[model samples]
Target: DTQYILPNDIGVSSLDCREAFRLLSPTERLYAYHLSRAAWYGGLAVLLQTSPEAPYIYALLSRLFRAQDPDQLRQHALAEGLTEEEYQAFLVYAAGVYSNMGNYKSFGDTKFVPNLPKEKLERVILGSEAAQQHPEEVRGLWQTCGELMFSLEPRLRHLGLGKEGITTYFSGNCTMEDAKLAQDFLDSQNLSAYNTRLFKEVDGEGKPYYEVRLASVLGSEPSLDSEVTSKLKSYEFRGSPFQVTRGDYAPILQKVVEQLEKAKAYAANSHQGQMLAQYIESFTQGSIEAHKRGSRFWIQDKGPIVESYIGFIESYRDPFGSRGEFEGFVAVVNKAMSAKFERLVASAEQLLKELPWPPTFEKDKFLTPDFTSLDVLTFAGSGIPAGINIPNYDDLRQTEGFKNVSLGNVLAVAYATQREKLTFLEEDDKDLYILWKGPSFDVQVGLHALLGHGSGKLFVQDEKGAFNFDQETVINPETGEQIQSWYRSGETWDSKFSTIASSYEECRAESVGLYLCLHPQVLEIFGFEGADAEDVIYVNWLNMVRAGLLALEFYTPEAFNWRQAHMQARFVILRVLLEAGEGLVTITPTTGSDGRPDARVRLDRSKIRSVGKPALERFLRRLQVLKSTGDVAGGRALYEGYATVTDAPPECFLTLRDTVLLRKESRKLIVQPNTRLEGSDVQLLEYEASAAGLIRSFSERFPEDGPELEEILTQLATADARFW
Candidate 1:
């Protein structure tokens, strides 16, 4: 349907960090500048990970727009008889590509095609001033990627492994069985899939062979290899030869490591310097352990003017939910707002005790996290997150500590642009929804990151047959029997539950946010009190329920698959609320202007504690226990029940998704500002926050990726053709 195309002139806004950027000292500005540079370069790896043609498509648009300013190209395009909207559509499509770092939506792993038809797209390309200057290059790129850009056949539409949908994490032929086999092999070797891709092939005799490729700068170089990174490792898995190789995304990671060194020179302290050093090693040698070590320093080096994290993180896009897509961010600290978060951090231990779970299910010590609000300078990735809880390594999260960053500017821009005439909401509620949505999200993100993600304990049994929890005393709350299964040696939550892990954990964390928001003490931390606080909680609940209804847009009916993790989690929560059955929450259909179908999602404010909280507590307790204990069967049975959408009444979202799609507004695109080093100081370059501005920002953002733009394009092209 036309829904796959991005809307013309969608919501566009810049990251609101000019004031924060200006306040940084000379050293700090240089620090931020280098880090942002690294982020942009490292972020390019996302294109390669996205799809087969994403890299070529990005290069084509970049070349067409970069050779000349966007204004010049627009003038030429309109001169060539394209309508204003047609030209605008072209710009928005290119902007979507740049904003997402590919042709896929970052939030929803669904593919997006250009709104402009193929002929109109060619008009924008051929009529541009860039075409006259670099005809061969631009024309060749168009010839190579043009058709692939607009194709949305069933397999090209969304990300998944094998026959389910599209994904670059594994080869076209790999299946869930192959993923399982590869995971078992990786586990036996104690290797993290955080920076790798898998390919299924055959030996000369046609027996199965799997090659795992790692992303790093130094590839197949024995002399430069670290202890953790060997050029290649081979194993026999289920009679199939499995080989692990390095050198994936080699040039991109080389540029990433180079900038990390420059940023290291301006480090505020030894901890920051050490953090960069670890990152440099990780990026250079493909060491996930080094990234973990760096995160330890990152957690300790709190409250810096320039706070940043860079590496392959967030495994949502991985078909198996273990391999990470490369992403990086550089942001400046927001002190006033961060002060509020630290107070919440101070209250985490006591507040966590109020959770519905038994004491045995909780972590032994609550490592008061370094929770801060940050104004993002550069977030070089497919999408910008409202808040982040990081170092996704289970060992680090379980034993040590972590950092929780609320992207102040990212959230501010998103909320400030709330003029969508929100569907599934009452007219009277819309105003309050706008006024309180930001604050409510702020509070929810705080809890969701701190207590939501921060509160869980993973029960582990070591290689020595030793249990972290008392094997003699710990009893399952659900069954009242001694706990049976747990994370054995070399096991992690993501690896144990595999694909079901991502959405299940997200559901657990979001349920925590919904459950915790009921408490007055937690509400008071975000500056809400009394009657005002009640409205904030109400708005927050309304936001989640509405989002759940809207989440249908990312759900694929034909395949019974969900493209986004958070959306899946919210949908599950909505089902949980509906299951409570006191009329606590309900979705009712209606007709709106133009005789289009519409719906309203509402939650009873009075019953939030009485009806909603109890249900969420019951569900969240089971969700956490399933994750913590690594009960794969129990986790799958429970999560799949809520995650799946049947066509039957009462449990059906597939049928109602039509109305949601009809009224769906385009998701906002964040126009990131770039920093430039000017003489001895750094200068901030801002854009117009329009579709054209998004193109111009990228054109200027990567004037040349070190050795001319063409070099990187060639690398991408060559990499795509050579089998993974």
Candidate 2:
């Protein structure tokens, strides 16, 4: 009597319907509908969520809706089944459950069928809402915000506020009594609290400024103001009170903006060679300002917060082969505890002058700043304050000299964290971790910035006029001649050139120079006792974001992440040096069978991961040899091994989720539309044409030698690193 009797009405006969239904040449999917009326439908939903395939969902839906009778349902389910009305009821229940869970968005509003009773939907929705409104009560919620806030020092509160007016609030009103009050409030609620602080900027006149502390408690209101106020007494941090509009670095930033505008205009008007000329001119104009006026101010501000010495300091660890990373710490400065390093920072200039080095320097000209600050750091990212060393850039260090400021507060946080973290490490690695992870790390950071970076001399040509330099060599590209050297000379004419160059130029060169020298693995010569190449690979090669990721791994082991990075870099530098000396190099093949032609360059996929281990061992041996006999030649021999004359290959592929794809392809390809394919997800390929478009646009904006540019492009197209 039912006009459209569903599969569930067909009874036990449905078990034989699967093969018979397919043989019947059905117009729409019929066998699927009968199977949906089976009692075990809940298991089907679970399978769908896990697979999430379109065909599977469609097949399931078809079975639920298109059956002829209960007998057919029994045939498909291969078991006892229900009547059509019972099957319809089951559909209503499943749909309501899916909707309440927010998983029915795929079907839109049409998801509801008339067969489903409305009462069920209402029940699920009401239940879900009730659960959200009142989460299960937990014990930790009892901690009051006041107790949490007072437990931490005031310095930490300033850091959370940033460069504006925030520092003033705490600097003027932080007291131990306030700390006690905040702690009492938090203890009442059974909550934990933290305090944070930071030094933000250096004034134009060269005075350093501090950012005030911010106090935050866990298990409190989501809003910063509400969290501090609801449980604490007389505490409210609405917004920072410091004014960033009047800081010392403002003028320099303004100049940079102006230069950017001028460059923009030049780019708009010029063509080909003229464009290149304008770009260089604009760059030089800005470079002069940055090198002279801006360098000193920026240095003073950020310098005190950095926590590295001999090695490159970026964030925390590098994942790529870039030269910087991010790192921060939260800690209280023991005002009484920092007195131990007063003499060290005070005599930094003298030690800098006396540090052994080559003859290409004027020892008396090195600039050293007296550090006198009492701020504690709560969280430092990309940098930390322990030992302040600045003007590490080769051009700046060799020309105008530099300054090193030791941060007492930043070192204390590192010291504290290292002790807690190192306790769980393996025995052999634990001692090494402790040495560099603790105060020894503090000493190394200080020595690196103050002594190691400060020790190197500017390179000067010998009697033969042959110059020894890399990217740091300041040459007048227009005249193909070297700029003035920093060495003091018997001839008065030599001193004149050094004095005449603008401070910006000197500083610019020094910054870039120091970045290259220290950022590379060569610094291993100074002896990083418990370091590895993976650490170096992270800090030197990975950018700030990637380095932070690598550093996060170190928190589990309590190793001095920074020291590990430096040591690793040291090893890589030594490997390159040794390989170059032996007239051998290494290369790697892409997932695509692109072979490189250079034999001196050794290429293998496995070598990439192993690069750190061998590189570190060789660096240590060479470092030991250098220390024993002061053999500069031996060091040079080691360095030579690292150089490869060949260019990196073009057209490499990177392995993403499923397999490797051409770098350019991943950048360009778009997906096409086909209903069957559209609803179904597929990883599409990118094309080289898209990459070409970007290249063309970039070239139009900044054109140099086109042929030379093309060569660079070829290298990029083929270049790929093996990441494990």
Candidate 3:
């Protein structure tokens, strides 16, 4: 619990997208502006999904900063006998809350408490111009949120479903078994939980009633009919009555749909317009199918000058791995870098053959995606990835197309901001590791997003009873038998695999990225050749190996939970590399700076192909076969086997987990820029790279105060109040 405190020395950085923003035409800029507004507005849904106390905390902080400047607030705190470190701790905590949209760590799925004590933070909050003016509101928020903000009980330490952990995705009373029952009901109804939350309550005659709350502005009135839910549906599943109710994040999604409507006027193409139209419909009426249709149009829109995707996407945070948290991203295309991807796309069909699996396992046809590099203007999510391959809808992906974007600014800033200390690397490799990580990562992200995620075919029986592949033709390369299993009509990859799906797929994709990187042609596409290419491959594999060692920190041993998907994937991969046993990867206990105990990581550069590739190929083969055939038992057994940390021998992950946790640095909190409308023009507002800057960004980003904030507060209380 004490380890969960966010370090007072946490780093804060800004996304330098001013150059990219300047390059956009005024019309394109306007398109980006409105779309970004929609993303930011919809992004507030994350605060609700995150934790019970998050909204109150967000409201409290936003009000405090809006009422008084950060410097003035600091001055007040300092005058009231708060130490500078104590003040910085509070500042960091506030920024973390704003950055993650909650008290929980987005990356680790763990709660983060302020390093500053409660009374000191209260003194600062109560002394503010915010408190002085809205005495009742501020004090009331403190009374409600202040204690819960720092609560680190056993279950509250991390996010999970049922007694295993805590999640707002379901009510506290709902368990893993209830989630399965709820999932079965949704599957039977052929409905997606992408834009929904689950709640359990005792109503009327004292029988258990489940509310499957949909995020929309509209309600269950017969007059309020939509394509998704015909007059707000209701049903009984396994003797428990459940109602599909609407209007979860009503006010927030209302704001989202309005901005989307405004954005449609600026749609560059018919496909873009259609996409925005579908998005507005979906957000307004709570339709995942509408969102799916929008994704199809979005896929067809080729390369737009302004790139954006909104609504519920990437189900990583949801404990069940089906419900998508709200996220929106508006970006500018980096055409110069995109040209490199276009070349990769042109050569992709030939590259498909290079993959280890039989041709039947790969997509029937290589859907040449609009792979581009994007400089993000606004990314409204708990956290942002280095790149994305999206429209996670399998139907669109299997036969149709998808787009991949390598976030140029996100990747660039990662290298630009070098850290002071290097972890788990030999002294000799430090400089080379630092210099080449960016280039290696670009190559990795390109492969990971493109071929890795983009190149898989799920054996399926569609709604029409037609199989995607012929039983007589397609063979399981692993079993060398005719395919015995395929996704049932209503069963999705998400539903078939359940909680393990996200991490398992990530592992597969990440392995595919590294697996393909060994080829000379793959490295050449990313501008590496000869010895330079070899070095990049070595560094790329090294980064992954080192990353796996670092991943031990996210694993909560007592709970037997892997807190994050990507980290869990990496750790599993590390086990594969270690099990290969040719000096490929090793983590030995050692000493570090200031004579403290540490672990030294070593990866054999020469054996990356000879030893490493062979091991990963075998792992990847099984993973893909499990995923493709919808063999849930096989998938679970294989993935969970590798993911288990036994605390065995040369690499005791459990023991070193503590050492790594101590050495771990706080993740950087992004202090992003916002665009304001100024008489038919959009002007950019940037912030300094500091805690105050992060708090100020959120203040402007969610600028609701006084009466407007009260309305939002009212919404929070009533939206789904089990946790609240």
Candidate 4:
């Protein structure tokens, strides 16, 4: 019995169940309960690291909670020098940022928040009474604080690195040349570790070239001159040489280990149990090798009723895409629904064979993956994906196979949200969305997770016992020693593409799903029949293109730096549609607020195969080759050529962005349990609790760590207070 509430006028409802509560068995439920508690504790550590202002903001917001009257708060805000309109806007903007726990706006963008002067904001935040008298001093502080919230890289810790630094630093490769240098080095050295390093040095000839160093050689001291040192120091990886070791994350890892041990006890003799133990070891030792070993075990665990991906997983947060971010999710297998994917699972190998690539490029034997639908009970990090294919290590995936989990319940929530928020669809498309949205999405997610990610070979050895691609080695001018580097032979696709890896992989997955959607056999597996099936395919393609158009809003008009992977992927598809020539997907202009024409996208079914399919196949083939050969330059060309928006964005891009921004600003409901878990049978406790209660329970359990949790709790408490 899940409690549901409608958040906005669009008729979307979110579940008020504890995170992933629907997926847990009795014993697994008990384990999830404790694991979630542990994750909450671990999350405290993440909050402390996410931002420098987080702690202070948390305390201030808690105090602000006492100010219940909006009139009084408005008076106080105006007294501090904000205009009436600005004050109102500030409250709304502040609430969203606070709820998200940090500022997510692009640097220098503060249109949503108050236009308070910088010094005034500083004064206000510092509680200086001068803020009340010297209103002009605070003029730009709102924008400044917003920028600082993300960009201000702290010396003591690395939490404040702006998007640029995070991407540059985590990417391990600073530039395209740096990526090439690292790739060459890895290929030469045959390095197993993906987490290597990139630095700059000037040659004797006064020219600069990037140097690749193993993490083992880079000592832990935060050298003032070194960017890597500063970033690593911010991570608080505390050891003799400084790494993300157990010693550094002792406080958080200890709790995680404790919960994992409990889970292991319950899952005795299970591969999942062994995998958890390996993960604990990996965390304790800070060993990537151990983590990979754990991944291998996790991938092989095909029959588990209860499953969880708990640890440092996903590299999206790191710009370099080398280090894994901390995330956890516990889920229960939805057997009845999962059974439906059996036919799809069985057909996966054949689908792999059908990919538009040569036999030499394809895997000799495709690992028939264990595909299932999961009911997630809890997600420990920022958010969870609608579908997941675990064990990101390329070698492990190729050797031992992988698991594709379609988050059924999560998708249901997203479907509900999409139904309410979607405003870009044409009237004719609206009926199609309603009729086929659910099943089409299910098939898309399944294909994306199952074959999209799981397919593709990183490297193929040629007949002469050499890789198809050549490895370049650099000679040290003075030493006359050959500097080893990464090439197709030894490097993973991520190492070659760096920051673009996630985006490339996402695009690849989407392309696979899109391409396969046209195949009659694939559609039949989803239970589509005859002419209706083709109709569903056409509608799905239209919806996907529309979705891509809407996704352009995520990018800034000027920068067009697609930070999120899925967004980048969507942009690529939209580019393909736009580039496919007229009559397939038409882009027209609608009059906008500034009396300028904004872009509006419409799909035409007449050219589905002639235009749409050819363009898709071309892009898909190019991507597959780019990935297989680790062609970094080609990859960059693909991204820049299509993904980057021009200085004068097309009318359609502007129109889509405006519509999306409106929908983005609309009032939305926060989903959290609204009942207490009081009874012995926690499963039967159909009651839901407020989001506040969830925070309170965790805070109380770990009272010693209350300060950090307090800020997060405050954010949750005020999550629903929005301008719209």
Candidate 5:
């Protein structure tokens, strides 16, 4: 009964492409083209291509047309005695920079700024000779085309001017003062309003943009297609699903089990297992190779499945980079289902060219060969993705790619519970309540995940000058330096570093490849409910858990789960903001180590029992002032003051927990039992109390922390205030 399924027979996940297409029609075709361009171009690639001098290009573009007076720019232009026409052109020049940086917000075409006529806007932009002469602005525009392709980390702890924003600002304007002033104005306007629901910001005179410091009082909860807020009251304080399901493996557990049963077992080769186990042993010893090869095991049962693909395949995405302990159910596809998607295989070039991507990225006609002919490996892991299109490793993808997988088990889980969840979560919108379930969510996830990853193309170069689109470095054209090329930036200065750019580029290339593997979009495509497109959260979640486990210095199932859920929600909020706050999440970094610039989000800590918000807020406001002034050197100084590169001083929770999931493997599988500190049974009962009771109790507890904490968290019971 070893049946092999092909791409055609794979379930045809459909979206009302017409509806998606229709949404595009109302907007200018050029805007869509730019968005698609940004996606394909890749964030770092576009960031690299941007004028290095204008580090804040993305942020500048993000806030260009916000109606906040462009006082700095206007002042500079007026000082030069620029006429009305020149001033208008100067605005165009600035706006063009924003456009090039892939800022959909500044382009005057998005839903936020829909009133402006697109045709007229285009005319004004095209008419500007100043923009034409400054090709850097155009490059910014072209590079930003792939803006959506990358993941952004909207961390509550670090809210400052990001690398890309700083670079753009410096390059666009000769003086940092002008850039800093503009940034401050933008931050003030942005902070005044909480358009995005997830967080709020606080700007300081010195540190211009930082967010309110809050605690995670509400822990993690289960999410389907619905907004997680619905199950908010039921959230467990310590062992909440929101806290520990990092490696839930729930999505693909059944499939993995099936695969395990069907997989041909091999005899226990003690010698070979020992030899291969050397690799695992080496890994257990904390050697680098363990991260490279992972844990390999020999099964006693010989089955049809090959060992090459055995072990937790997806665990590579974990933070600890350890082998996942969960087993999977496997199945070969039905040829009929596989054949349908096979069409994408032949049309790779078209798909790549047409995919929603960042512009200015190098691409080839067809990088992946016969994506259709590749075998479809299908399975789901416990706390893993329900579906996957595999041979996900970049080298494997380059040589012998795989097609889409259908996680039937995952889909079933989603289909069963999503409707019920949405019903509970939906607000005043009865229409959404009606449209919340079924084919809509399923198709969106499927197409977004399956077809989405496959849609774009890239150009890359390996040794011997052989060039292809499978991989390459993302370099900033202005500095001719690769952006976020390495964990350490100064390595490029070594004289022996002939291929320093390429060497670092290769590392970045690998980082991107690994990112593609763990992207939430990939999981979302498998019909996992509440999945987001951003991969940063996955990486951050993995990192956070790894940091947590490392800090604990021992493995416990409960702690692992708690960290997983905590980091997962942390990332969920991050991903949600990145997607919803399109214009707001405005900066990228040069080395990827420097925090973002000019964005503010409030972190709610009042709900938690132990944390002190006032201390956190006072610290954050000081940091905010540093950022607002475009004071990179000062900002870094302040950042180091609050947080350290090394995790120490357990009081700094952001560092001690270091919640960003660096890799996916950290959350992949469980090898132990829950061991984190457990709460009293009475507290657990109170946590699970009625929503009204929970809210009231939380309200009452808010004032106990102190006057400062009380002021920041408690919503006064006034008619003017919205909270009930």
Candidate 6:
């Protein structure tokens, strides 16, 4: 139906693109326009490959939104002779589609609800009398628009395997094997084949490894028959060269190259242009080395007004959490706003030296980060973060420095959302929150981005002169010559800790941010004085406590999944809070009917720092040592010690969990952006009615190359068909 509520029906936290547009200069607006298109095109690749159902789900949403009336939509489906049950199934499927939009997979674990229950969806599709007809009707729409649907039947039938089918979607592989083996192989390779499904095999020595066996290899293997091999080979990798070089991804790369070229033309003689050129070369050749070169240039580009990060970035999706996912964002720097934080940026080096860790753990030379505030025009792939510190490569970050960005507009939207959804705070804490939220939070985000991520150096070699880790060793599968030493030279924090790396790093940053908040100098810098400054301490303590409590919700009742990086970090903080004396806080039952006590978190201001400060410092030091020395077992031990939730957690822990759960279930705060194009200008409306509306609007405005991008998107839709 055309009828839809303006803001509430969609997500309210959606960025007001109109307001963002007003902040940009004319030149910057034009740059924003092109970058938005590039981001949109890049996003299509992500959407298509995220899940087999993702593309079809997107199309269904588009069709439903385009329908003039709900009744008319029902009539059209009826005309196709869909039974009542079939129609109901279709509606349910459509309603939950957006849940699977992000890169991560959900399978009855964590907070996110899966788009469609696998069993229910499959039963309807395979068992219903009208199932084949209705699915075909929906599938026909995609096919008519030149979209391809591959292996629809198999994906619906079997829930792909592994833990909640997450690996199948994330690894882009359906060859269900041992999880440990897959992780080991991925670590050894340091190559994330996003578009290809991985198959595991044991070496002659019975050591496990993984590879993307080509169609020829599969066809040749006696284990797989002709039909099985054919199906296995049908799905192709996401980027160019199909597997690693050049082929299926050529068209997408060509479009990306064209945009990069235009961007380069606009910024000639600058490192930005050279950086873009390097990215184009990387895409052309499908070389990670070329990608690294581009990142180096990007890091060196000191003062560009237009800032963009394009290509494979972030490894959150990979099970191993080391391979970069495809993502990008284009934004213009808000220099006037950025100037406010110059003093804070300059203080990063000083702050780094102040950490509790020994001098050996800290970087010898701190790169006073080039900090800026940005108004993002567009972000490709899943979504954007409030702040970002880039060049994830430890070596590059240590030697070449890094950049810190606080997305001003994004933060403004988040703050606005928090104000509206003020459900997280206790009644007494509300006024205090209002007084200290903005200023203290600003300091927290600034310090977190600048100093938290910028501090600490990974040890290349231990004091005994043994190389720590290596990703470049060539192992002989048969002879096992360099296999043992392969990981020695290329060790980074990410490789050693695997899934826990992100969580530990996040905790490190957050601990630094909170610890620094207590410093008188930091408080003075933030313009807090007397009572206001004291209130800052209260806010920081309350905020940290609240964060830790909320994080407990992510862990299961039985055990700690530690799937979410931020939440796991929060758990560690909560543990620290609990370890503080009884005088600091109290957790008790709120007179509930059930045996389980309702959790309440009450903080005593007098004891906040006495308990919190030392605990934070201790946690930070432990995290730093683990990171610097590449101690995977040490890191795991620390997490196991603090992250696990017992059958009867502290009254405050349970109270916090219950309070958060009640608030979360009762609230529906929308936080998705609505992106589109207005003539030659880019517009990212928040909580729009349909993705089609945005895509169609953009298509009309940029018709010349829209079809080309669409073709690439269509190809990517079925790129990993075999995996499903």
Off by over 4 Å in 2: 1-291, 294-342, 345-356, 359-364, 371-387, 392-401, 416-437, 460-567, 572-724
lDDT of each: 0.83, 0.28, 0.85, 0.56, 0.27, 0.57
Residue 635's lDDT within candidate 3 is 91
Q: Write the per-residue lDDT of candidate 6 for residues 399-425, one digit (tens) a residue.
A: 888888888877676554344455445
Q: Which model scores highest in lDDT?
A: 3
The residue ranges of model 3 lying beyond 4 angstroms of the native Cα positions read 203-207, 416-420, 702-710
Q: Please report how far candidate 4 places residue 124 from its true position, in Å.
A: 12
Clash pairs for candidate 3: none
Error of model 3, residue 604, in angstroms:
1.4
What global local distance difference test value does model 1 have?
Answer: 0.83
RMSD of 2: 29.8
Per-residue alpha-carbon lDDT of model 3 for 128-218, expressed as tens digits? Answer: 8889887998888888788988888887888988776678889988778788888898888888988888888886887778888888877
Per-residue CA lDDT of model 2 for 1-724, tens digit only, reads: 1111112211110001122222222211121121111101111212122111211222222222222122343233222233445444433323332221111211110011223233442232223322234323111111211122122222221111122101111232333333333333333332322122122344587543433222211222233333223433223222222221111112222322333333233232222123223222322222222223334333333222211111112311211111121122212223343443445556555444332222223233555543332332112222233454553344455555555554443444333323333221234444444443443344445445554545444443434556444325544222355444322212111112211112212222222222322222223332332345234323232221112222221111121111233322332342342343322223233233243221111222234335533443344434323322223454335432331112233211111101111111100111111101122231111212221221222222112232232222223212210100
lDDT of 5 by residue, 507-597 (tens): 2222222223233443343333343322222322233222222332111222222212222322322332233331422222112223421
Question: Which digits, one per residue and each the tens of the lDDT, describe model 1 over residues 1-724?
Answer: 7667888858888877778987799999998888999999888888888877888888777777666677777778778788888778778888999888888888877888877668977887866677788777778778878888988887778888887677788887788888899888888788888888888887688788899888788776674556565537777777888888888888777888888999999999999999999999888888888889998888888778888998889888887888887888898898998988999988888888888788888888777789999988898888888899988987888788889999888777876545566787887779888788878988899999999999878889887879878888998898799988788777877888888788888888888898889889888878899988998999989988888988888887777778888999999999899889898988888788668887777778889889998899899888878877889998999999998887667645776898888887778887888787667978888888888888888888975463264457557556656452
TM-score of each: 0.97, 0.27, 0.97, 0.72, 0.28, 0.76
Worst 10 residues of 4 by lDDT: 1-10
Q: What number of clashing residue pairs does each candidate have, in the order they appear?
A: 0, 124, 0, 41, 151, 19
Ranking of predictions according to lDDT: 3, 1, 6, 4, 2, 5
Candidate 6 local Cα displacement, residue 491, angstroms = 2.1
**In model 5, where is the ten-residue run with the lowest total lDDT?**
1-10
Cα error, residue 608 of model 4, in Å, equals 1.3
